[PDB]
C-alpha cells in the first residue's frame, strides 16, 4: 500500500532511473517514496574511507563496519526490513517480491568490493528483520543493479505504483498477420477459444521442456 | 574490444551505464531509442495480441527496421525474457569474448516472436532470463547482463563465506580469532568450512540436495 524505500550506496546516481520511473499520481497519493543516500555522509575521516583490507588476507577490500553501522542506525527502525544483496544470499524470487510488497519500510544496503563486514548484518539482526539475498547465479560488480531489480519486481506488485496492471509463457504475436514470410499461427485467428487455449498450453509445455527442464 | 548496443523505448533508464564497469576503452556502449525507426506520427510500437489475452505486444515491423541497421551476421542478439534460457556465470564467460552484443529490451507483454525467429536466419540469437521473478521491462536486465560480462572481458560452484576488516572488536562482536592468527592453513580450512556451511543452508541445490519447502 504505502511504502518507503531507502537505498544506501557509494554511487547514488545509479538509482536515478527508478526514481524517474515513478508515476507522479502514486507519489502525490502518498503510496510510495524512494530516497537514495550517499554512504560517504557517514564516513569518519577527511579521505571519506569506506573500505579496508580483509582479515585473514586475500585479494580485494571489505566495506567498513563503523561507517555502515552509523548509516543504518540513523535510517532503520525496529520495523524496517533490511535487504542486503549478495551473491551468497538466499534466492530472491517472485514469492519474495510478493511478501515484501506489503512492507511499510525497506532499506537496501548496496555493497561493493568483497562486500560488507559480516558484523553489520549480524548486529542489525538482533533488533530488526534482515534478509541477505541473491538475484541470480552470476557475479555483479556492486549491489546497485540488484537494488534496481528488487525495487522494480516489488513495486509492480503494489497497486497503482509503477503504472501497470510452474510453466513458461509461450510465444506471442500481433499485427501484421504476415511479416518477412512468417505468418501468425492460423489457430489464433480461428475464433475457437477452447482450441486456442489448448494450443497455448502445448506451446508452454514444449518451451518449458526445452529451456527449463528444472521446472519439471 | 567489445561493442554493445542497447535498444529501448526508454533510453533514459540506461543512464547508469556510465558506471556499469571500469572497462567503459575496452568496451563501447551505445543506447538507441526504438521510436526513431517509426514512420507513424503517433509512433505506435504495440497492439493487442492475436488470439486474445491481456495487455499489448510489441510489433515486429519497427524492431525489424532497427535491427537491420544495427546488426551484422557476426552479432550476438540478446533478448531478455522471463521465459528464456537461464543467464548464468557460465553465460557471462561465454559472452565475454564476443565482438558485438545487441540487447533488445522489451516492454508491455514482450516482443512478437517473429523478430527473434527472423533474426536467427542471419545471426546468433539468445533469449535469456536473469532470474525467477518478473520485471516491467528489459532495461534493468540489460544493466545486469552488461555488469556481469564486462568484469570478465580480457584486459580487466560454492557460496563465499563471511568477510571482516578493522577494528578486531566492534560493539562487543569479535572477528573470528583464526583470521588474526596468521596461520594460512587453518584460515584456508576455516574459510572452506564456512563456504560449505553457508551453501548447505542457503543453496542446497548447488551441492545436489533438495530445495526447501
Ligand atoms: N548475484 C548477486 N545478487 C545480489 N547482489 C550481488 C550479486 N553479485 C554481486 N552482488 C553485489 O555486488 C557486491 C560485490 S560482489 C562481492 C563478492 C564477494 N566475494 C562474495 O562472493 O560475496 C556484493 O556485496 C553485492 O552487493
Ligand atoms: N526475469 C526476467 N529476465 C529477463 N527479462 C525480464 C524478466 N522479467 C521481465 N523481463 C523483461 O520485461 C519485459 C516484459 S515481461 C513480459 C514477458 C511475457 N509476458 C512473458 O511471460 O514471456 C520482457 O519482455 C523482458 O524484456
UniProtKB/TrEMBL annotation, chain B:
SUPFAM superfamilies: alpha/beta knot. It catalyses: guanosine(37) in tRNA + S-adenosyl-L-methionine = N(1)-methylguanosine(37) in tRNA + S-adenosyl-L-homocysteine + H(+). It comes from the Bacteria. One of its GO terms (cellular component) is cytosol. Transmembrane segments: none annotated. Adenine binds at residues 130-131, 133, 135. GO terms for molecular function: tRNA (guanine(37)-N1)-methyltransferase activity. Keywords: Cytoplasm, Methyltransferase, S-adenosyl-L-methionine, Transferase, tRNA processing. S-adenosyl-L-homocysteine binds at residues 80, 106, 129-131, 133, 135. Residues 193-205 have a biased composition (Basic and acidic residues). Residues 192-213 are annotated as: Disordered. Its main location: cytoplasm. Specifically methylates guanosine-37 in various tRNAs. Belongs to the RNA methyltransferase TrmD family. This is tRNA (guanine-N(1)-)-methyltransferase. It comes from Mycobacteroides abscessus (strain ATCC 19977 / DSM 44196 / CCUG 20993 / CIP 104536 / JCM 13569 / NCTC 13031 / TMC 1543 / L948) (Mycobacterium abscessus).
